[model samples]
Target chain A: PGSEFEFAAMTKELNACREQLLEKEEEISELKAERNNTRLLLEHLEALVS
Target chain B: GSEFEFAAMTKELNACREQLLEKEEEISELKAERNNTRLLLEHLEALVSRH
Candidate 1:
C-alpha cells in the first residue's frame, strides 16, 4: 500500500499546513499591534477635542 | 480492513481543518478590531470638523 511514501507525503503536508497557520498568526499579531496604536491615537484626539 | 490507512487520512484532514478554522478566527478578530478603530477615527474626525 506504499505506506512509507504515503506516510512521508502526509507528514510533509501536515508540516506545510502548520506553517501556514503560524504565518497567519504572525500577520494577525502585527495587525493587532498596529491597530491598537491607531486606537490609542484616536482616543487621544477624542480626549483633546472633549 | 484498511483501518490504518483510513485513520491516517482522517487525522490528516482534521489537522488541515483545524488550521483553517484557526486562520478564519484570526481574520474575524482582526476585522472586528479594524472596525472599532475605524469607527473611533471617524468620531474623532467629526469632532475636529465641528471645532
Candidate 2:
C-alpha cells in the first residue's frame, strides 16, 4: 500500500528476475557452443564422404 | 528516497522482462536448429551404413 511495502516487493521481484536472466544468458551461450560443435562435426563428416 | 527511484526500478524491470523473453525465444530457435541437424546427421549416417 505504501512505498515501503511496494518497494520491498519490487526489489524482491527485481532481484529474482535478474538472477533468472543471468542463468538464461549462461544457458544460451552454452547452447550456441554446442550447436556450433555439432555443425562442425557434420561438416567434417560430409567432407570425408563427398 | 524519491519518485525517481521507483521510476528507474520499474524501467529496469521492464527491460529485464523483455530480455528474458528474447532469451527464451533464442533458446527455442537453437533447439530447433539442433534437432534439425541431428536428423540430417542421422540420415547421413544411415546412408553411409547402407553403403
Candidate 3:
C-alpha cells in the first residue's frame, strides 16, 4: 500500500508546478518585449536629438 | 553540562545564518550578471536597428 504511487496527489503537484513555470515564463517574455519597445523609442528620440 | 548544550545550539544557529547569507549573496551576484547581459543585448539590438 505504501509502495503504491498516489497518482491524484502527484498530478495535483505537477499541475501546480507547471502553472508556476508558465507564469514565470510569461513574465520574462513580457519584460523582454517591453524592453525592446522602449529601446526602439529611445533610438528614435536619440536620432532626433543628433 | 546543560550550559554547554545551550552554547552548542547557539553556535549552530549562527553558522546556519551565515550560510544562508552567503547563499543569498551568490544569488544576488547571479542577478547582477543577468541584468548586465540584458543591458548589453538591448544596446546591440538598438545599434543594429539604427543601421
Candidate 4:
C-alpha cells in the first residue's frame, strides 16, 4: 500500500544531500593536505632563517 | 498538511545554497593564500641557497 511507500521527491532530496556531503568531505581532505604542506614549508623556512 | 511544508523546503534550500556559496568563497580564499605562500616559500628558498 501507499502507506509503506516512500515518496520519490524525498528520495531525490536524500540523494542530493548525500552527494553534497561527499563533495564536502573531499574538499575538506584537500584543504587539510594543502594546510599541512604549507605548515611544513613554514617550518622549513623558520629553521633556515634562524 | 499546509503551506509549512513548502516553506520549510524553501528555507532549507536557501540555507544550503548560502552555505555552499560561503564554502566556495572560503575555498577560493584558501587557494589564493596557498599561491601566495608557495611564492614566498620559493623566494625564501632562493635566499637560503644564496646565503
Chain B TM, per prediction: 0.76, 0.69, 0.74, 0.66
RMSD of each: 4.2, 2.3, 13.5, 5.7
Q: How would you encode candidate 3's per-residue C-alpha lDDT over B1-51 as one tens digit per residue?
A: 354654554455555555555555555565565687568768868998999
TM-score of 1: 0.62
Task: Write model 3 residue lDDT over A1-50, tens digit each, in one string.
Answer: 43124444444555555555555555556665766676686688679769
Taking the tens digit of each residue's C-alpha lDDT, what string does model 4 give over A8-31?
Answer: 454466557656756875786798
**Could you say which candidate leads in TM-score?**
2
| Candidate 2 ranges with C-alpha deviation above 4 Å | B45-51
Q: Estimate, for each residue in B1-51, the C-alpha lDDT of model 4 and write its tens digit.
A: 354655566566666666666666777777787888878879877997999
Worst 10 residues of 1 chain B by lDDT: B1-10
By DockQ, rank the candidates, best first: 2, 1, 4, 3
* Error of model 1, residue A25, in angstroms: 1.2
Which of 2 and 4 is ahead in TM-score? Answer: 2
Location of the lowest summed lDDT over 10 successive residues in candidate 4 chain A = A1-10
What ranges in model 1 sit over 4 Å off? Answer: A1-12, B1-6, B39-51
Candidate 4: list runs displaced more than 4 Å: A1-18, B44-51
Mind giving the per-residue lDDT tens digits that candidate 1 earns over B23-49?
878878888879887886787679879
Candidate 4 matches the true fold with a TM-score of: 0.61
Q: What docking class should model 3 receive? A: incorrect
